[PDB]
């Protein structure tokens, strides 16, 4: 061929300021999966399965844990009520540490102006003592259920001891008032700051938590239904927004206490029945003391799984046998918002295969959460009002 | 990042061909420096996608890894990355503060080749 030279010169948002106002605000944080949706079709069930907790691996058990759901929901097999429960303790766990590190590590120093070395002692020095915590219960939980490699399709691979079931709960136990603490915390510090506008909600709904569900939740649910998606950003665009109802919308912790308020119980019903006014549908920030709530609530929840686990002290992981020609679409809810998996698998290989993130759904509201008027400084507002989403990464860029 | 490196490279290329006045793109060589951590295969793939409803479409896309040369000016010496290589968790890092001029006692070494990322051939049908 023709060899020639063009030397080329090589994650955050950009806002382009002026002396008139703010005129142009765009962001390209996130790429797409679609990779992996080519190169996990052709290989192994099982492989695809391995190279899935690639992708946001930041929150990777949530992923391979859905996925499988998927898998299962193709081949028509049921997992027992057993191993779902314990699914949804894993995911429990891994809710509890990705919310503490995000809450506290971000949120904090958000508005107590933190920065640098985040550990002191003046202040933060309980509040690190729980967040660590936290943070190493959730992550001991992860690794005693699930390094990785563990869960496998129908059944698991090895299952913990009833001992360490019995101290996790113990753990749990000790491990309440922080987080009771926490929602305290986050139910003194500030909302809108204001960015406050209709925000449409979105979160899967359960018989009795939020934690595993069949049908999408909005005013008006459904079951099995695929939304909007419009590739946007063109001139510079590496994401493509989501579109639910024709109208940019919002995912996350909000969510789920929006459309499933009337499934929640215990300490958490109480204090969301008391606090029912600061966390609105409409606000972005009240997200992160939602999360806080959640902290609260699945700490409990995971407790009578585990009275739920222990109504048969025999426990051996199942086998399901593969089914040729099998759609199957598993919709959780990730701590980001809810997480999609449309997996179709014909002769035992990957056929189709669409996996949708929680930023995505939350990336196009984000974008329409910019009303930010101030004159700097606001890069520090704005990098509030994403935290308040709780992103993977993110940075401000202020064009000037 | 693979995906915003392959948009560059899109736009780069499609704009190119809108100088020259091509009317499609039949196969595209780029060659990369090792000091990028993106995945080939990655890359490529977004390549191909982001070609697609152009008139750089259905290219084939070749890529040519570059080997990386540092050279320290505390003793004028100049050395590679295969010998540091052999001497294994979060192996590739930043070279400013990871590793020295393995003769004299000081890292302040200027990278020469391998940085950066260049288009080397492009099949052009007009
Ligand atoms: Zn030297």
């Not at chain 1, 996990?40 to 899935?52: C, F, V």
């Not at chain 1, 070395?117 to 699930?146: F, Q, R, T, V």
């Not at chain 2, 190119?16 to 990655?42: C, F, H, P, T």
């Amino acid at each position: 061929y023709l060899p020639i030279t063009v030397d080329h010169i090589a994650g955050g948002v950009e806002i382009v300021v002026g002396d008139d106002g703010v005129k142009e605000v765009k962001l390209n944080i996130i790429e797409g999966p679609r990779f992996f949706e080519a190169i996990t079709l052709g290989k192994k069930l099982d492989e695809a399965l391995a190279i899935y907790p690639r992708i946001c691996s930041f929150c990777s058990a949530a992923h391979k844990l859905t996925a499988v759901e998927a898998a299962e929901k193709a081949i028509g097999f049921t997992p027992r009520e057993e191993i779902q429960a314990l699914r949804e303790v894993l995911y429990i766990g891994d809710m509890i540490e990705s919310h503490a590190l995000h809450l506290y590590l971000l949120v904090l120093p958000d508005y107590l102006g933190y920065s640098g070395p985040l550990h002191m002692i003046d202040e933060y020095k309980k509040e690190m003592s729980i967040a660590l915590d936290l943070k190493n219960l959730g992550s001991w939980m992860m690794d005693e259920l699930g390094h990785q490699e563990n869960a496998v399709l129908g059944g698991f691979g090895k299952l913990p001891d009833k001992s360490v079931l019995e101290n996790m709960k113990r753990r749990l136990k000790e491990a309440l008032p922080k987080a009771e603490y926490t929602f305290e915390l986050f139910t003194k510090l500030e909302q809108y700051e204001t960015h406050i506008a209709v925000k449409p909600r979105n979160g899967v709904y359960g018989i009795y938590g939020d934690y595993l569900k069949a049908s999408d939740g909005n005013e008006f649910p459904s079951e099995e239904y695929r939304e909007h998606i419009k590739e946007f950003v063109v001139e510079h665009s590496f994401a493509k927004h989501s579109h639910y109802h024709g109208k940019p919308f919002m995912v996350g912790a909000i969510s789920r206490l929006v459309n499933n308020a009337d499934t929640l119980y215990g300490r958490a019903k109480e204090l969301y029945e008391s606090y029912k006014d600061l966390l609105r549908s409409t606000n972005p920030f009240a997200n992160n003391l939602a999360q806080a709530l959640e902290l609260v609530y699945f700490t409990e929840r995971a407790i009578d799984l585990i009275d739920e686990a222990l109504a048969k002290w025999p426990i051996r992981p199942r086998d399901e046998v593969a089914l040729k020609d099998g759609f199957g679409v598993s919709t959780t809810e990730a701590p980001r918002g809810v997480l999609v998996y449309a997996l179709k698998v014909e002769n035992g290989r990957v056929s189709y295969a669409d996996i949708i993130t929680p930023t995505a759904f939350n990336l196009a509201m984000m974008e329409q959460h910019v009303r930010m008027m101030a004159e700097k400084k606001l890069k520090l507002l704005a990098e509030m009002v994403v935290r308040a989403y709780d992103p993977c990464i993110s940075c401000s860029v202020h064009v000037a | 990042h693979e995906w915003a490196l392959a948009d560059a490279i899109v736009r780069t290329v499609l704009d190119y061909a809108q100088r020259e006045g091509a009317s499609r793109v039949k196969a595209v060589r780029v060659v990369l420096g090792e000091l990028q951590d993106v995945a080939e295969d990655i890359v490529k793939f977004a390549m191909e996608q982001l070609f697609a409803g152009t008139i750089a479409e259905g290219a084939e896309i070749e890529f040519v890894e570059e080997e990386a040369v540092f050279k320290c000016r505390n003793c004028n010496y100049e050395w590679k990355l295969k010998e540091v290589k052999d001497k294994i968790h979060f192996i590739p890092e930043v070279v400013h503060a990871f590793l020295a001029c393995p003769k004299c006692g000081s890292h302040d070494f200027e990278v020469v080749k391998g940085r950066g990322v260049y288009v080397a051939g492009i099949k052009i049908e007009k």
